[PDB]
Structure 1
Amino acid sequence: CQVTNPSTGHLFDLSSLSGRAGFTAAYSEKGLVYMSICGENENCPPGVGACFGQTRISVGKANKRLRYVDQVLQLVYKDGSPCPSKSGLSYKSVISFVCRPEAGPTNRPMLISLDKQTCTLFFSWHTPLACEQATECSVRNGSSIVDLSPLIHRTGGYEAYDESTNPDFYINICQPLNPMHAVPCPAGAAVCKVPIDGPPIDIGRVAGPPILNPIANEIYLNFESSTPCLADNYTSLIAFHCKRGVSMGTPKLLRTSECDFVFEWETPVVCPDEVRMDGCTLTDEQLLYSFNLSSLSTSTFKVTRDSRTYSVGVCTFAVGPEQGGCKDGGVCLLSGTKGASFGRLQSMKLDYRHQDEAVVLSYVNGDRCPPETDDGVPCVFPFIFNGKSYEECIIESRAKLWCSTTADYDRDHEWGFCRHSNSYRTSSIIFKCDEDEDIGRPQVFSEVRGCDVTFEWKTKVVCPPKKLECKFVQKHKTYDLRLLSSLTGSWSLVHNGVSYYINLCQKIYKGPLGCSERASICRRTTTGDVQVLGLVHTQKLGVIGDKVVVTYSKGYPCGGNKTASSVIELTCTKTVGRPAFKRFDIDSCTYYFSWDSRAACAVK
């Protein structure tokens, strides 16, 4: 019940599998196959390794004859019962063992395909017991390693595009292809080709580790074949080009050079980790001041909803060296026994949300999102089935990978065949402004299909310019408006009984009730309510032909997402003048004010 390697002489032992009680594989829906390893199965006639379900049909007589075929441990069960094809022709089974380092509940035998012509049953079993070395899905780059491991497909395989709904190519990278429903890909294959017309041909086998280009750097990956070309053994190649973003990106076919297959894969994982331009601070061109989020980075936060507890870090890993769950992860859904990373801290992006005055931190590229059923109803992890708790799609009493849709299958019997996700998990915090939240505390805002999390965090950190500089430069000329910026009260013009209150670079002080805080320019209709015409923090300064212009946005609601605005223009004069009213542009909803001032005049 053992075989060794012709080139290394490594030991393989399948004694741990040699049960008399054996195991069960499925074919069709309610069809079953009972089988033992290196011995006859107690559910079959004496001297038979595997047989058909209800009707004990010998699909092969048991033996210890274990062949090693290219990284794969292969058994053959010969001289089974008569075959429908011709007289005396025996049924035969090919139980083949493919390597897989991870254990897990899907380490079980399966019919991958059935040749009806030659009565050959094709089986595959995925075991750590069949592994010889380690999974080499990384190559060293200078001081830090580059690691393709998260791209490893662990349930099936990547499907390559329909070039010049039917399948075509199949791909996994550092472990071989997983068993696939009605896809007769040969056991142990890494890269597979399915032709409409023709039994699927092996074109790629996981050769060595990824290789590194020391120049304008990309990453390659060689794949081999024992199956021969129609002009010469087929070769296969995946080139990796770095592309940042949410999608980890499937491989696509590029060149076809006939005895050679070349692919291309655009992926975040190949990108160098980039030290952030300006640390834990958000800076936008449009407002030119900035927020310092560092005071939050100071520690992690445990946010929780419906028993789901996330640990969240701002500019620091979600989990220190203690829970040790989400490697690299900046947000982490703690499941005690584990952790799911909802985005790599390194991938962090900070973007100002102009529409909302809010700041959006976003981590990306965590762990794969969970599967749903074929009919699109989400899986529930963990679930109980046959009195055991499962955390992933299983193959038990069924032909294809399936999950439960309740916490307790045994009780509720609801389920569906898994269709797997392709998005890896994202998270984001949206930072909203609140003056008396010194450092706030995030809460859960939205969760979608266990694939994204968004928190709302109200800090003081993302608020505070109520005071601004009036020293700016345009085309090498410096103007100093600090003269007109009153630290005590404001300026007021009365135009047509309507009072206007206006203060440069600063909050209006002792303003009329209705003039909010932050209000840079105000308006009070004779006996009517008052209207904010602009806010100080949205200040814009500039020069237009001899005039110094100052702009304020985000005033009162002006119909159809329009908001009031104020534009004050200043020609240079001798005095420190008073502001006057010019016009109110109806279409833009903008107020134009005149000011002759000594302030609008650069000097040296």
Structure 2
Amino acid sequence: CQVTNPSTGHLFDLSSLSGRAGFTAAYSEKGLVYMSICGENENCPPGVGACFGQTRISVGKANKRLRYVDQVLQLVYKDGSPCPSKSGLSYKSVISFVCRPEAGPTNRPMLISLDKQTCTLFFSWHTPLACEQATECSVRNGSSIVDLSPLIHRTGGYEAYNPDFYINICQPLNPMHAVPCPAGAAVCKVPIDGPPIDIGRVAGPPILNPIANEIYLNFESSTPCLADKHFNYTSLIAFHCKRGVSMGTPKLLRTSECDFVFEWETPVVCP
């Protein structure tokens, strides 16, 4: 139950979570999905690695094929009960292990979405077990050192105050009430009756420009742009010092075909 990052030669190990005893993911105040990570769950039919409901409805047969896909580790449990939507179909689960450097109170899988017509359940597990480098969230500005970490949203995300935009810095977006933003995404566009788009992932440490007196954070998505298939969707945050009784929320500046630029007026970049 382990996989490697083919780029930096970094081994990830999830066998820490393995076993028939397994874990639960909540779909209500008391209603749970039962799952194990590599190998079946004791609370399910044989083979079945994730199931739920009074009658153990299978949402995938267990496998240990743990895949690495863009700073997100992933299992796809396959072949559950039939589908009412598209006839010859089966319920399946996509378990997406997302990096959360912190301890974090939750530490369990969570149901982000169900693709009804293709019967896909999407779970996410925000875990330190899916991290490589630590949160690069600070930069040096002369004698001082500006920490943007106070702006890292730790339990959810930020708005953008009509296509919605949700954004988080230094870390992926956390799962949030009925907003199925893709797993791993730091910057997420949400259109109406189009699926949520990843328009940027954590790209590195905040970069400082001392002439224009601005701090930049850059974001790059894995998903290819619409107009040109050879560029990725991109994101930029311009940080501006602004004395205030509260830290600002990132307003959007302007957009091109593939690029997105955001300003953030926070009393956090102030000397």
User: TM bucket by the smaller chain?
Assistant: over 0.9
Is 1:255–2:251 an aligned residue pair? no
1:256 is displaced (CA, Å) by 1.2
Structure 1 CA distance for aligned equivalents of residues 191 and 97 of structure 2: 25
Q: Does the 8 Å CA contact 2:50/2:60 hold for their aligned counterparts?
A: yes
Number of the residue aligned with 2:136: 136
1:64 is paired with a residue whose SS is: coil
Q: Does the 8 Å CA contact 1:159/1:167 hold for their aligned counterparts?
A: no
Deviations 1:453-491 (A, max 9, x none): xxxxxxxxxxxxxxxxxxxxxxxxxxxxxxxxxxxxxxx
Structure 1 CA distance for aligned equivalents of residues 29 and 83 of structure 2: 22
Q: Does the 8 Å CA contact 2:86/2:117 hold for their aligned counterparts?
A: no
Q: Does the 8 Å CA contact 2:167/2:188 hold for their aligned counterparts?
A: yes
1:228 is displaced (CA, Å) by 1.5
Q: Does the 8 Å CA contact 2:49/2:61 hold for their aligned counterparts?
A: yes
Structure 2 CA distance for aligned equivalents of residues 97 and 167 of structure 1: 28
Structure 1 CA distance for aligned equivalents of residues 123 and 99 of structure 2: 14
1:85 is displaced (CA, Å) by 2.3
Deviations 1:486-545 (A, max 9, x none): xxxxxxxxxxxxxxxxxxxxxxxxxxxxxxxxxxxxxxxxxxxxxxxxxxxxxxxxxxxx
1:197 is displaced (CA, Å) by 1.7
1:107 is displaced (CA, Å) by 1.6
Deviations 1:405-447 (A, max 9, x none): xxxxxxxxxxxxxxxxxxxxxxxxxxxxxxxxxxxxxxxxxxx
Deviations 1:145-185 (A, max 9, x none): 22101100001100012xxxx88110100011001111110
1:82 is displaced (CA, Å) by 1.7
Q: Does the 8 Å CA contact 2:86/2:118 hold for their aligned counterparts?
A: no
Deviations 1:54-78 (A, max 9, x none): 1201100111111111100011001
1:246 is displaced (CA, Å) by 1.5
Structure 1 CA distance for aligned equivalents of residues 215 and 105 of structure 2: 33
1:229 is displaced (CA, Å) by 1.4
1:129 is paired with a residue whose SS is: helix
Q: Does the 8 Å CA contact 1:33/1:53 hold for their aligned counterparts?
A: yes
Number of the residue aligned with 1:68: 68
Q: Does the 8 Å CA contact 2:163/2:189 hold for their aligned counterparts?
A: no
2:223 is paired with a residue whose SS is: coil
1:86 is displaced (CA, Å) by 3.5
- Identity across the alignment (%): 100
Gaps of 5+ in 2: none
Structure 2 CA distance for aligned equivalents of residues 248 and 87 of structure 1: 51
Structure 2 CA distance for aligned equivalents of residues 69 and 158 of structure 1: 25
Q: Does the 8 Å CA contact 2:82/2:89 hold for their aligned counterparts?
A: yes
Higher mean alpha-carbon deviation, 145-154 vs 20-29, is at: 20-29
- C-alpha change, 1:18 and 1:216, in structure 2 (3 Å) is same
1:236 is displaced (CA, Å) by 0.6
- C-alpha change, 1:167 and 1:231, in structure 2 (3 Å) is closer
Structure 2 CA distance for aligned equivalents of residues 60 and 197 of structure 1: 27
1:44 is displaced (CA, Å) by 0.1
Number of the residue aligned with 1:601: none
- C-alpha change, 1:259 and 1:86, in structure 2 (3 Å) is closer
1:88 is displaced (CA, Å) by 3.5
Deviations 1:246-301 (A, max 9, x none): 1111100111122111110001111xxxxxxxxxxxxxxxxxxxxxxxxxxxxxxx
1:46 is paired with a residue whose SS is: coil
Deviations 1:371-408 (A, max 9, x none): xxxxxxxxxxxxxxxxxxxxxxxxxxxxxxxxxxxxxx
Deviations 1:108-153 (A, max 9, x none): 1111011001000000001011100111001122233221011000
Q: Does the 8 Å CA contact 1:34/1:53 hold for their aligned counterparts?
A: no
In the superposition, the TM-score normalised over structure 1's length comes to 0.43
1:217 is displaced (CA, Å) by 1.3
1:9 is displaced (CA, Å) by 1.2
1:87 is displaced (CA, Å) by 3.9
1:29 is displaced (CA, Å) by 5.1
Deviations 1:188-209 (A, max 9, x none): 0000111122111110101011
Large movers: runs of 4+ above 3 Å? 28-31
Deviations 1:337-384 (A, max 9, x none): xxxxxxxxxxxxxxxxxxxxxxxxxxxxxxxxxxxxxxxxxxxxxxxx
Q: How many residues align?
A: 266
In the superposition, the TM-score normalised over structure 2's length comes to 0.94
Deviations 1:77-109 (A, max 9, x none): 012222222344121100000001111321211
Number of the residue aligned with 1:174: 170
Q: Does the 8 Å CA contact 1:191/1:205 hold for their aligned counterparts?
A: yes
1:28 is displaced (CA, Å) by 4.5
Number of the residue aligned with 1:218: 214
1:245 is displaced (CA, Å) by 1.8
2:257 is paired with a residue whose SS is: coil
- C-alpha change, 1:2 and 1:183, in structure 2 (3 Å) is same
Number of the residue aligned with 1:28: 28
1:263 is paired with a residue whose SS is: strand
1:51 is paired with a residue whose SS is: strand
1:214 is displaced (CA, Å) by 2.4
2:254 is paired with a residue whose SS is: coil
1:231 is displaced (CA, Å) by 1.7
Q: Does the 8 Å CA contact 1:211/1:220 hold for their aligned counterparts?
A: yes
Structure 2 CA distance for aligned equivalents of residues 122 and 215 of structure 1: 45
Work out which structure has the larger RCO, using CA pairs closer than 8 Å and 6 or more positions apart in sequence: 2
Q: Does the 8 Å CA contact 1:205/1:223 hold for their aligned counterparts?
A: yes
Q: Does the 8 Å CA contact 1:34/1:44 hold for their aligned counterparts?
A: yes
1:183 is paired with a residue whose SS is: coil
1:37 is displaced (CA, Å) by 0.8
Structure 1 CA distance for aligned equivalents of residues 156 and 86 of structure 2: 35
1:265 is paired with a residue whose SS is: strand
1:221 is displaced (CA, Å) by 0.7
Structure 2 CA distance for aligned equivalents of residues 193 and 34 of structure 1: 31
Q: Does the 8 Å CA contact 2:138/2:147 hold for their aligned counterparts?
A: yes
- C-alpha change, 1:86 and 1:167, in structure 2 (3 Å) is closer
Q: Does the 8 Å CA contact 1:38/1:63 hold for their aligned counterparts?
A: yes
Structure 2 CA distance for aligned equivalents of residues 113 and 90 of structure 1: 16
Structure 2 CA distance for aligned equivalents of residues 231 and 108 of structure 1: 38
Number of the residue aligned with 1:15: 15
